[PDB]
Design an enzyme around this catalytic site. Structure first.
Site, mmCIF file in Angstrom:
data_model
loop_
_atom_site.group_PDB
_atom_site.id
_atom_site.type_symbol
_atom_site.label_atom_id
_atom_site.label_comp_id
_atom_site.label_asym_id
_atom_site.label_seq_id
_atom_site.Cartn_x
_atom_site.Cartn_y
_atom_site.Cartn_z
ATOM 1 N N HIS A 1 0.010 1.455 -3.578
ATOM 2 C CA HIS A 1 -1.387 1.935 -3.534
ATOM 3 C C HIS A 1 -1.506 3.037 -4.792
ATOM 4 O O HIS A 1 -0.554 3.756 -4.960
ATOM 5 C CB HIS A 1 -2.108 2.577 -2.352
ATOM 6 N N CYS B 1 0.695 -1.108 0.048
ATOM 7 C CA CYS B 1 0.029 -0.034 0.039
ATOM 8 C C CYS B 1 0.639 1.299 -0.038
ATOM 9 O O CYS B 1 1.678 1.599 -0.751
ATOM 10 C CB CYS B 1 -1.060 -0.197 1.099
#
Lengths: 189, 189
Positions: free
Chosen positions: A126, A106
């Site tokens: 992400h 992420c």
């Protein structure tokens, strides 16, 4: 031989799904996981206010290395705390030097940038963390849900956490163990 | 009006992924979640040894109802603890009586059986919990990853937890809010 060992570094503001999914799935593989608190031994307030009690402080856990994998959860604020930590820097540099796996999800991979780890690797993050990760062009960006370039293993978000965790299991213990761990999870895959 | 409220009942041996995923995703929807400890206010040791500090005891949280949804995580031992609890019985009967949503995942739905909740509904569970859930034929079994029959919302396992959580969001706050919450998660869907 002895079971492998994973270090999961848990900072305030970590994404709790990205913390718990890897911890749980890696423990299902029979790998010994230490949830280490960046700040100390006290409970950690995650990004969505789940409070997790670490197994140890990072200060103590570091002493019990080395680890077969170092895992960096995401969450923007957790990743920022990881990125600012001299202790994290030292751990990641040691792991890199010793040719050990590093796994980050992420916003987590942005701590690799902060600590100058794994330059020249293909990485994912992400979508919202791409620009931060790519500042300077030190990595090549991937949109794969899980990316693995040698000993740098990255992934994208809460919804890739199972794939991420299973990739860590596969990297450590092989495809068959990963498949065995996967089946009871009821993943759509 | 005011934001909706969810009660997540957290017992020793709960599946921590099935606890954290719904808590986090429901909070992303702007819904107020109370993680209530079955045993009291103290930290809870989950099935894979993640330790979560509840927001409140169940004893206290019950007093702050009613809730728009009551959520029962799975984990075999957590579900067993939920099934044995007179306090859980009371909460579920009240929620049923008031036509409020009840959501349970994995082994969690077996607590509905224990407490005689929602008989005559279509339900799913983890495959390994089907026989327990179906003892007596009080429900009709489904293999859908998420099943919703009126106010009884069930799901299968760790790997259906995102779908489960998003279904709770959709049931409370609608399709559009659920879609908005879903997008940043990077789910494969």
């Amino acid at each position: 031989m002895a079971s492998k060992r994973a270090l999961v570094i848990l900072a305030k503001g970590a994404e709790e799904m990205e913390t718990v999914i890897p911890v749980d799935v890696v423990r299902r593989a029979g790998i010994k996981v230490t949830v280490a608190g960046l700040a100390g031994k006290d409970p950690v307030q995650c990004s969505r206010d789940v409070v997790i009690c670490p197994d140890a402080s990072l200060e103590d856990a570091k002493k019990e290395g080395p680890y077969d994998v170092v895992v960096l959860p995401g969450g923007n604020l957790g990743a920022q705390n990881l990125s600012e930590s001299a202790a994290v820097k030292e751990i990641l540099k040691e792991q890199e030097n010793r040719k050990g796996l590093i796994a980050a999800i992420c916003a987590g991979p942005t701590a690799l940038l902060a600590h100058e780890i794994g330059f020249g690797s293909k990485v994912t993050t992400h979508p919202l963390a791409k620009d931060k990760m790519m500042n300077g062009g030190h990595y090549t960006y991937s949109e794969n849900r899980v990316e693995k370039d040698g000993l740098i293993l990255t992934s994208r978000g809460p919804g890739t956490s199972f794939e991420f965790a299973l990739a860590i299991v596969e990297a450590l213990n092989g495809k068959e163990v990963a498949a065995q761990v996967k089946a009871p999870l009821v993943l759509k895959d």
